[PDB]
Amino acid sequence: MKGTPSFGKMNKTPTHVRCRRCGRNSFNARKGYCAACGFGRSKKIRRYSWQNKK
Amino acid sequence: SPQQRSGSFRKVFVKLPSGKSTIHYERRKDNIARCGMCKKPLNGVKNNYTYKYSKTEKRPERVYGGYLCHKCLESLI
Amino acid sequence: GKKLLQQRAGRGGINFRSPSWRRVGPARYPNIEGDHKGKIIDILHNPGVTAPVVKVKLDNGLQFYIPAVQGVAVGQEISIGKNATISNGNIVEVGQLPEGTVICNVEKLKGDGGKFARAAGSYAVISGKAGNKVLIKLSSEKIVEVSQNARATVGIIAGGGFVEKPLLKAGNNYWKYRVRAVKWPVVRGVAMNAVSHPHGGGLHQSVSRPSTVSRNAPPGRKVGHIASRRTGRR
Amino acid sequence: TGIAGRFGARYGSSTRKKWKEVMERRYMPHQCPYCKTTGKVVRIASGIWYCRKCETKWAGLAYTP
Amino acid sequence: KHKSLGKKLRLGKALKRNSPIPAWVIIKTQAEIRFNPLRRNWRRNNLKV
RNA sequence: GCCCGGAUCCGGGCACCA
RNA sequence: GGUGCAGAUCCCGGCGGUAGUAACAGCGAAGGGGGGUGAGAAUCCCCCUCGCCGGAAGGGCAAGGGUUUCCCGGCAACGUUCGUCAGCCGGGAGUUAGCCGGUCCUAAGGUAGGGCCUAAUAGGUACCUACCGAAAGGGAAAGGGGUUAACAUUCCCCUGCCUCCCGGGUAGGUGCGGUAACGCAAGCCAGACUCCUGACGGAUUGGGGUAGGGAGAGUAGGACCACCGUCCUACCCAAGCACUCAAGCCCUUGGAGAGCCGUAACGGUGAGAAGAGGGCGAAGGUGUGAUGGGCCUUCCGUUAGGAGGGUUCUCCUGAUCCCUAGUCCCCAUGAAAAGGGAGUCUGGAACGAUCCCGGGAGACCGUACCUAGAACCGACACUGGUGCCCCGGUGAGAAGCCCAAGGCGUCUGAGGGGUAACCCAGGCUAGGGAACUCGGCAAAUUAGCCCCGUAACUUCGGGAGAAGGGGUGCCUAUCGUGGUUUAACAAAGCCACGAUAGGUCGCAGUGACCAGAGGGACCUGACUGUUUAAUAAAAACAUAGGUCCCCGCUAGCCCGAAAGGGUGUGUACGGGGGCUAAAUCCUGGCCACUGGUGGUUGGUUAAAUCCGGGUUCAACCGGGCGAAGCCCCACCGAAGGCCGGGGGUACCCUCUUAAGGUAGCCAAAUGCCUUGCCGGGUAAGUUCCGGCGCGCAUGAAUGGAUCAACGCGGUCCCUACUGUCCCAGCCUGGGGCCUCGUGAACGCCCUGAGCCGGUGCACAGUCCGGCAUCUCCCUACACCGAGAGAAGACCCCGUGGAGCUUCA
RNA sequence: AUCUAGUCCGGGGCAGGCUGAAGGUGGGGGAAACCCCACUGGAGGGCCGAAUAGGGGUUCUGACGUGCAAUUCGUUCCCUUG
């Protein structure tokens, strides 16, 4: 069932672990990629121009 | 960390005068040494989990004694 | 609409790839250039291929697999090359064989491994000779044309009568496709919705148009009978 | 129904009959081509057979040697 | 309990410590009542992995 | 508007942004 | 000028009314007496007793949590009530390894750098090289007894083992036994090649063990003693080392049949059976480890301790744990590596071990605690989810019931009540027995095991536990069959199962518990399976069987912007694409339309090129040549599909547009009229069954007819049974009611709301006319407040959307 | 893609009973082919079956519906060698 019984299976190992470069818990473990700074396939810091309103 | 078939359960009390019971986990038995195409392990050859360092205790004393009996051999000499 | 199943099957995701690590190896002729001799050392089962394979050892110590021929035993001696005789299991050249000789695992060029008549029970006959090439009649009744020095094996692929026993239940066909790439089970296109198939939609399940389609239809439309010349049972 | 009696009343009378005639051909007493009918021949897989006396393995059809 | 030494070997802000104000600071600052604004509880709050 | 075929009309295939 | 608020389902903050009201019951547990601490005890502590779990509420450990662990001291908040208590608050502490795991190996899979591609990369990647990928796969070597408040295969004691390196000897270099299978202290260092463990499915069965559980004898201790003398507790031992082994497979001899040998079963044998000897060989066992412990117990001093006794014997049963062999099955044939051992060769030195003895070394990181009706996720100390592994009587049983070992009365609010009405769960009812109702919904009936007996139908397998009939307790003795014990059979002791004779009691002997109501008829899908997580489990999907289409591999079908890629480690008995839906009996006529395929005298046909005119050059006008497609022709209905009318005497002619509904079936889950007509069943039948066939609008893989078996599918009838009803009554558990503690939410212009007739956008608490009306409180009821809750889903509008389709 | 859908790789499970397919043996018949009976054997997308062994989610249109719970609880049921 969509709600309370299925949230019980959210106690395994997480999808995201700590990242050495940025110190945020955004390193996607299964893909070898930080979803916050790009560490893993970007040498440059992950940055986009939509990342704040103008 | 519960049960796994790659380990056999033992419980011991027959040869036994003290008084308690527990469980020991050992690895399954080995087999006479392996790869395969000719497929016959031998008679008189030894396989143990540890090695008693033996040399002639773990092999017969014929020409090709440890290799195989006179079956898959004479087309090699 | 959405992409069809055959359009998803072309991206080659793990749902549609072949589990080939479970087979003995590629069952092809090796590249050799003499008149050698071999010995059959084993007859094995190849999981998703329908024909058993033999393992051959050459006198210079070369290992390879080829589809087994009906009536060949383990420990038998076979010859390879242009001077090979006409016996079961021998790898010969098609330029040297008379008319009406039954062969299998026929190459098209010299050194491709074998192309035609490889599945279980299938064979080809020698049906003539062009100027530079020999004419071979395949099991589809068509005629193909191959080099003078294309290698072939003498005899019929083992495993005939394969299809004379009914599978008799849906689970006997569940394993069969566990080791193959075929998708099973198969949902009829009339049972889908209009977003997923050109046959879907409607109150009553029916192919809304004639099923025959042209050879020039874009992908996502070639369903039913493809460029048919005829339909009907007779 | 013979050997086909292990299915019960499923699959249809004519479908069970075809299955039964193929199996009765497989389990006939076959004769070894190499030694003779001495040791009986058995199926390893589809197209793979051997005789249990001479230990000779060969390639044949799917349900008969 | 299997810790891969990035949390148990380095100890600090990575699996260590959650503590009240030291008692001598409360006296020194004369504060009416002095709390740690970062206090958490193992059961209610969440610690990042 | 054309070509073309057939008895000015008809047919076939292409031309044609108020 | 950021300039004036009552409204924006306005934003934010504070506060009312409801109201000291609901809730603190339901998911099968329960407390009572005596004493203590404390300012203050239903709730914390001690003793006795009583109740509950006992295949989980007990024991062991993951992922996840992250200090929750242990000691001391507290109670402002925190815990559904209280609290002196705590997973809370303050102060101190706690995790020890050559042998456990990571670390290493590879799996499905991935990445980096090169190449190739990209406008470019933080993009793609078939190829090459390297690396990554498992705390349940593979993977050298440890056990016991003890020790803390909190750690222990990690610390102490005893007894060990692995890998590498030293020193001293020795077996070898230069040695032996056997017909043989084989037996063994056998050299060293540097290579090459090879082989075999590693290293593998499901089903079923025998044999051998072990944990565990029992009976009897004895010695100590305990419990009961109205009378019997029975009942409970303890009695026991690890790894390593020495020795032994059944199955199986091997080695000598031997020489068998119209037969022998052998199994639980299949079976074995001149390609050499039985009989005689032998070789290699599990789990375990027996010694040693160990006058060492740990278990039970007595006495003295009762501080520190000290001094004794026993720890034996004979049997039975027994795994879902362990190892060992058979056999069978597949259009299933059921991982790979590091790391091990051995063999055969080549080169080198004369010193030298895979065997004994002594010595040294073995990084680094994890280790506390919970592992769940309070430590994980769900906003919560959430009846959900996440867990896996294990556990005497009755009995087939890990079921239901009762009880040990262990745990609990914290699924954490209580007290009073001759216990109101009513509600949620349960028991029983005279006479009748479906009269209730859309409908027998719900409830009742039956029920285990042994013997007898069992119809139509049928795909010959089933139906089938069909239907139906009889038996069953207790006591007193027996018999038969089999197991086991150094055990052919017979005796003896234990044990299991199946029967026999007699005696006997009750309303009732499967006495509780557990535990099928049955039969007849039709529709529908063949069957086992799948589905709308959170209103649909089905007749829908799938399926096996059938049939059609594309393609000879540089193919066919599909993905990409390209480099390229999936099917493919594949080859027509195949890969890809449709429709139908097991089997049985069958599958009719039509190629006019649309679509597909092929062909062509011929017509039309773009750019480019060619020719003529024009322009000192062009633009621009013409002509010729003119591919595919289209026009034209033919074929194809298990391609989409379609299967009428008129005139004349079943027959013939004509038009739409080619033909004009064959076999079958029917008022159908398809028939408008319509409750069609006749019969059946009922006292009475719009439903049901049978028959008919004016078929609005049945019909053949768009599948027609057809039901054997199956169904948490739809419907009708009968028997049995009953509180469903006539028609209600009584009893029980938990709430409600009264009291103490905690403590919300919705309605709210206003508090001004008795009602009847009117008025008025046409149904007033408030207006008009009447008739009424002393104030407050408690319980109960929900008729009215066009009661509360949600910018109506219906409907229409807007030159608003979104998804689908095609002849836009 | 910690939920869920499909797949591939490596693992862990399903108390206790019933029916009795092919095959095998021995009687009894008939010259024969072959038939009848008893036993043995252990097949199958067979059958009965554990609140909480595991899986599902039909009935009461039961309780709850400002919940224990943004999908739960009780009864009646369905599956369990593929």
Only one residue has tokens 């690590």, namely: C21
DSSP string, E1-49: ----SSSSSS-SSSS----PPPHHHHHHTT-SS---TT---TTTS----
- Say which amino acid occupies C103: I
Report the distance separating Cα C164 and Cα C38, nearest Å. Answer: 34
Q: Does A13 touch chain E (CB under 8 A)?
A: no
Lookup: tokens for C41: 């050392």
CA C78 to chain centroid: 24
User: Residue D35, annotated ligand binder?
Assistant: yes
Residue C31: other Cβ atoms inside 10 A = 9
Separation between Cα atoms, residue E49 and residue A51, nearest integer Å? 26
- CA-CA-CA-CA torsion sign (B63, B66, B67, B72): positive
CA distance C146 to C152: 11
Query: How far apart (Å, rounded) are the C-alpha atoms in residues C232 and C225?
Result: 11
Both tokens assigned to C167: 């599978």
Q: Which helix (H) or strand (E) holds A50?
A: none
Residue C44 near residue C24, CB atoms below 8 Å: yes
Backbone angles phi, psi at A2, to 5 degrees: -60, -35
Name residue C96's amino acid. Q
Nearest to C38 by CA among C29, C49, C48: C29
Whole-number Å distance between alpha carbons of C156 and C71: 9
- Which residue shows structure tokens 């299997």? E2
CA–CA distance, C87 with C155 (Å, rounded to integer): 8
Rounded-to-integer distance, Cα C102 and Cα C123, Å: 6
- The set of strand G positions with any atom below 7 Å of a protein CB reads 60-68, 88-91, 101, 107-112, 122-123, 135-145, 153, 161-163, 176-177, 181-186, 194-200, 209-212, 234-239, 241, 249-250, 268-271, 279-290, 292-295, 312, 319, 321-324, 328-335, 340-344, 353-355, 365-370, 372, 375-382, 384-390, 459-462, 526-528, 533-534, 540-554, 556-559, 565-584, 591, 594-598, 635-641, 702-703, 708-709, 803-806
Q: Is D11 annotated as a binding residue?
A: no
Resolution, Å (one decimal): 2.7
Structure tokens at C135: 């004419």
C194 token code pair: 């209009």
Tell me the technique behind this structure. cryo-EM
* Distances, alpha carbon C57 to alpha carbons B1, C88, E8, E31, in Å: 47, 17, 58, 92
Specify the DSSP class assigned to residue C18: -
Strands (DSSP E) found in chain B:
8-10, 24-26
Exposed e or buried b for every residue in A20-54, given b needs 16+ CB within 10 A? eebeeebbeeeeebbbbbbbeeeeeebeeeeeeee
